[PDB]
């Protein structure tokens, strides 16, 4: 026996397979583009056009280099970091730029945002 903690975990070939292979980083977004992210995470760029430079920003941005994505066994797309050893459902720099809009946006209204 290990007489302490046991190291028997499980492996697979399948949950070896990683997403993160290509990104451009010169490539400049269309306004159509801008307006598409802005109205995902949440924001109305007709009247909120300082969380829309926000968004102009958004989807040019990468993951942290320590997150990429993975495939997980049951046939599902997930992301995971490598420093840390963590898993998430979401892509990590979307769930950052939802919360940095938010926050932004109740700056700006002086926590009296609608």
Wanted: hydrophobic letters at 35%; proline letters at 8%.
């Amino acid at each position: 026996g290990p007489l302490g903690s046991m190291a028997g975990r499980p492996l697979r070939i399948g949950d070896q397979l990683v997403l993160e292979e290509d990104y451009d980083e010169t490539y400049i977004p269309s306004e159509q583009e801008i307006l598409e992210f802005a109205r995902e995470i949440g924001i109305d760029p007709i009247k909120e056009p300082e969380l829309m430079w926000l968004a102009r920003e958004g989807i040019v941005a990468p993951l942290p280099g320590e997150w990429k994505p993975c495939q997980d066994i049951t046939g599902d797309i997930y992301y995971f970091n490598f420093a840390n050893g963590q898993s998430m459902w979401d892509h990590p720099c979307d769930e950052h730029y939802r919360s940095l809009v938010i926050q932004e946006r109740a700056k700006l209204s002086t926590s009296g945002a609608i």
